[PDB]
Amino acid sequence: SQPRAIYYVVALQIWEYFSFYGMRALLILYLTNQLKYNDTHAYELFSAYCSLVYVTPILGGFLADKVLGNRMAVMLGALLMAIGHVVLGASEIHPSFLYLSLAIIVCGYGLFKSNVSCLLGELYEPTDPRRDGGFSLMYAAGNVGSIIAPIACGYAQEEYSWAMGFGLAAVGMIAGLVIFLCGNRHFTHTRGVRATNFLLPNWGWLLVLLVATPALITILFWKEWSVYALIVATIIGLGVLAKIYENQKQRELGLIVTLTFFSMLFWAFAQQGGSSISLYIDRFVNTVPTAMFQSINAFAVMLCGVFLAWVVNRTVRIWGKFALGLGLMSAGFCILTLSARWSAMYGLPLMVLGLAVMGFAELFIDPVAMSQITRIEVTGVLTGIYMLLSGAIANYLAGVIADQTSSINAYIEVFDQITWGALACVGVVLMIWLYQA
């Protein structure tokens, strides 16, 4: 019972999410298994990917805020992502096509994330009730594609080849793109730039897309450089946060810093969960295995979300929310660590449980880091810095935790340790807002 363009953006979200998360499902697995790549190199690449995927939407999603509009930069984000996924099928020739494909998709996603959010944002007026139902349709559609994808790319891989899998990701994105580009009625009117800021006609934008691509290619390629470009972006975000420290009297600011810190540690555990458990899985297992477990992440998230919207102070709220998210990440890793050491050491689906509780909490925290940002004291920037630290830094940290994993005894080492550590985060949170009350 919504407008036309909403069904469109919904379908494009389901197919884009399908593609991306199916690929990222196969990513670390493929990377170790048919590569020639050892564990740690694969961890640095995968990490690098996930992390930059969280970085580019800043500069990328802005390209549609200023010169391009939210019509063009989404179809561009989607084209970049499609071609990236396709070149990512041909990756088996040379250590080129890999970083090529990955940079094309980091660029594409870089556009598409914030561009599609702002694009749906440009449809409804500040009257429509159906606005919220459309964004919750974005939630649910995206997450449905999230449970569907790794089982689709999964059953596509092993009974055919990695080719059919990654090309199924590409094909999914292609169908999402066909679905979007078919027709009209979308808006945001991309225009306005005619030639030079400093020598900056279209040549500047060609240069921007092209050159952004190998700037990303060799960063995943050298991968030493990978770590450092974040450190660049990091001194940037921190210097800016520091600038944000206008007067205004009272400023939830530093306690939002507190937020983005605890959510950073959180996402380190969550993403590293994704990769380390992705490899751990096929190596120790008590119909297809492997990459289809990211589907139980997505599915636990959907269960918990369905029950969340089914259920319904800046003190009691944030207290409980963060302490519960952290608490269940920890518990998930306790049940997971005891899944590994019970499956083996003295004799597992309880690992499925561990993941399910990891999603179970994923639900719980970071609406609150995001609610608190929109509610601040401008707003759109704060969530950029947040997405930087929390998204990026936590994905590279996820990568490091992974490095420090790479047998079953080491895996158990890191899982147990991050259970007591996630729990340390919980405790500190509990203490904090208990003392707030």
From Swiss-Prot:
Biological process, per Gene Ontology: dipeptide transmembrane transport; protein transport
Transmembrane spans: 9-29, 44-64, 73-93, 96-116, 133-153, 162-182, 202-222, 225-245, 253-273, 292-312, 318-338, 350-370, 381-401, 418-437
Entry's Gene Ontology molecular function annotations: dipeptide transmembrane transporter activity; peptide:proton symporter activity; tripeptide transmembrane transporter activity
Periplasmic side: 30-43, 94-95, 154-161, 223-224, 274-291, 339-349
Topological type in the membrane: Multi-pass membrane protein
Record's subcellular location: Cell inner membrane
Superkingdom classification of source: Bacteria
Keyword NADP: no
InterPro entries per the UniProt record, alphabetical: AA/pep_transptr_DtpD, Dipep/tripep_permease, MFS_dom, MFS_trans_sf, MFS_Transporters, POT_fam, PTR2_symporter_CS
Gene3D superfamilies named in the record: MFS general substrate transporter like domains
Ranges of the Cytoplasmic topological domain: 1-8, 65-72, 117-132, 183-201, 246-252, 371-380
Keywords: Cell inner membrane, Cell membrane, Membrane, Peptide transport, Protein transport, Transmembrane, Transmembrane helix, Transport
GO cellular component, one term: plasma membrane
Task of the protein: Probable proton-dependent permease that transports dipeptides.
Protein family per UniProt: Belongs to the major facilitator superfamily. Proton-dependent oligopeptide transporter (POT/PTR) (TC 2.A.17) family. DtpD subfamily.
Name by which UniProt lists this protein: Dipeptide permease D
Species per Swiss-Prot/TrEMBL record: Escherichia coli (strain K12)
Lineage: Bacteria, Pseudomonadati, Pseudomonadota, Gammaproteobacteria, Enterobacterales
This protein's encoding gene: dtpD
